[PDB]
């Protein structure tokens, strides 16, 4: 039976290179002299810790980070930054999450879209991915259009086409 997988991939090496490029930008900027200002990627979690000495400095670092990630093909919708930072002593910091995979709350919205379509297809959650199967390749095409047009908050890719 024809099938494809819905995924959301953030390449580790592109993120490492973006973070490294962002760090280089920070160390070359005179306004960060004598300021602690760090951008650190956790490879295992695909999370980025951003820390400095004020709310505005954290936001300046996030702007640098978003621009460097964008040049690497990692679009802004793929970086989930909390609404509020952590303030602790003289430091402010935040964890920016790379949107690797499809979280539970987004998976349920995709599943609802597919059931609402009434197309004769079935969706099965598989870890951070979703497999979609159906007798009609045209219906599978329509599911892809529904997902890419669903305004679900992150880019998706479609892979593992089987027939």
UniProtKB/TrEMBL annotation:
Repressor keyword on record: no
Record keyword Protein biosynthesis present: no
Keywords: Nucleotide-binding
Recorded GO CC terms: cytosol
Cross-referenced SUPFAM superfamilies: YajQ-like
GO molecular function per UniProt: nucleotide binding
Family the UniProt entry places it in: Belongs to the YajQ family.
Described function: Nucleotide-binding protein.
Protein name: Nucleotide-binding protein YajQ
Recorded name of the encoding gene: yajQ
């Amino acid at each position: 039976m024809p099938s494809f997988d819905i995924v959301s991939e953030v390449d580790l090496q592109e993120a490492r290179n973006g973070v490294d490029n962002a760090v280089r930008e920070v160390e070359s900027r005179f306004d960060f002299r004598g300021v602690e200002a760090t951008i650190e990627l956790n490879d295992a979690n695909k999370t980025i810790k951003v820390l400095s000495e004020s709310d505005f400095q954290v936001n300046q670092l996030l702007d640098i980070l978003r621009a460097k990630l964008l040049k690497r093909g990692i679009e802004g919708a793929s970086l989930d930054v909390p609404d509020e930072f952590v303030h602790s002593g003289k430091t402010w910091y935040v964890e920016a999450k790379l949107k690797q995979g499809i979280e539970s709350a987004v998976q349920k919205k995709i599943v609802k879209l597919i059931k609402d379509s009434k197309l004769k297809v079935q969706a099965q959650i598989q870890g951070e991915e979703i497999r979609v199967t159906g007798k009609s390749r045209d219906d599978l095409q329509s599911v892809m259009a529904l997902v890419r047009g669903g305004d679900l908050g992150q880019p998706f890719q479609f892979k593992n086409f089987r027939d």
